[PDB]
Amino acid sequence: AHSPPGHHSVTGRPSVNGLALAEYVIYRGEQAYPEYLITYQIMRPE
Amino acid sequence: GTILIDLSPDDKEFQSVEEEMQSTVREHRDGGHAGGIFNRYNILKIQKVCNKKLWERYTHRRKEVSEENHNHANERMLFHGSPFVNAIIHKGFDERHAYIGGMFGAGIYFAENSSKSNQYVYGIGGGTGCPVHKDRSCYICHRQLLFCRVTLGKSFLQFSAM
Ligand SMILES: CC(C)(CO)[C@H]1Cc2[nH]c(=O)c3ccccc3c2CO1
Numbered sequence: 001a002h003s004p005p006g007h008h009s010v011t012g013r014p015s016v017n018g019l020a021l022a023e024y025v026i027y028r029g030e031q032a033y034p035e036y037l038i039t040y041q042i043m044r045p046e
Numbered sequence: 047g048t049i050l051i052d053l054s055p056d057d058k059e060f061q062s063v064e065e066e067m068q069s070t071v072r073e074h075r076d077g078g079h080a081g082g083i084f085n086r087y088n089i090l091k092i093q094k095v096c097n098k099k100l101w102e103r104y105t106h107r108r109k110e111v112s113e114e115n116h117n118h119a120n121e122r123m124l125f126h127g128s129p130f131v132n133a134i135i136h137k138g139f140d141e142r143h144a145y146i147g148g149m150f151g152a153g154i155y156f157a158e159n160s161s162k163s164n165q166y167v168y169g170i171g172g173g174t175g176c177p178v179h180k181d182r183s184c185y186i187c188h189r190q191l192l193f194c195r196v197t198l199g200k201s202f203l204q205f206s207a208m
């Protein structure tokens with residue numbers, strides 16, 4: 001797809017869950033650079 | 047042309063990235079279905095991704111967007127989880143990494159919550175979970191996320207019912 005006319009991206013902002021942070025969408029691969037590669041495990045709650 | 051450089055845990059840069067990761071875990075409304083049940087991560091490794099060609103591709107576009115947006119690139123650091131991570135660090139982001147069914151349009155998606163991106167490490171909806179155990183909440187297998195520099199430029203604000 002393409003971004004809205006006159007726009008370079010979309011900001012998707014949760015309006016119901018007040019603890020949920022934003023998500024963002026770009027429509028050109030060149031607008032992102034993969035700066036860090038993070039290797040991890042999720043931890044089981046104690 | 048990609049080189050991966052290990053950051054030391056004693057490095058402030060390593061510590062800053064881990065803090066971004068840990069501090070942006072939240073609870074999800076699927077109760078952990080897609081990404082698993084957890085409040086924090088065990089960070090095993092953080093590597094800087096170095097590719098001169100991919101960087102110049104990025105900064106060239108950043109300059110275009112910046113000038114189109116009146117000298118404001120609106121650049122962020124954001125998370126991205128994907129089964130395609132290893133293709134991304136070598137070849138860069140492209141249409142193959144678009145989310146066709148995304149509720150904000152068919153583009154490439156990034157998140158401020160590390161735990162939101164964790165939901166996509168094994169694919170949409172967490173796919174079938176880790177390869178080895180088929181467990182979306184696996185505590186054994188190693189996962190990878192990208193922490194990315196993203197140019198937003200003029201961004202359209204879409205509120206969502208989430
Ligand atoms: C693997 C694909 C490309 C789908 O084929 C996936 C990657 C992805 N990664 C995120 O971190 C994210 C974060 C928030 C919202 C959506 C996403 C998506 C949606 O697209």
Ligand SMILES: [Zn+2]
Pocket residue numbers: 176177178179180181184185186187
């Ligand atoms: Zn596993």
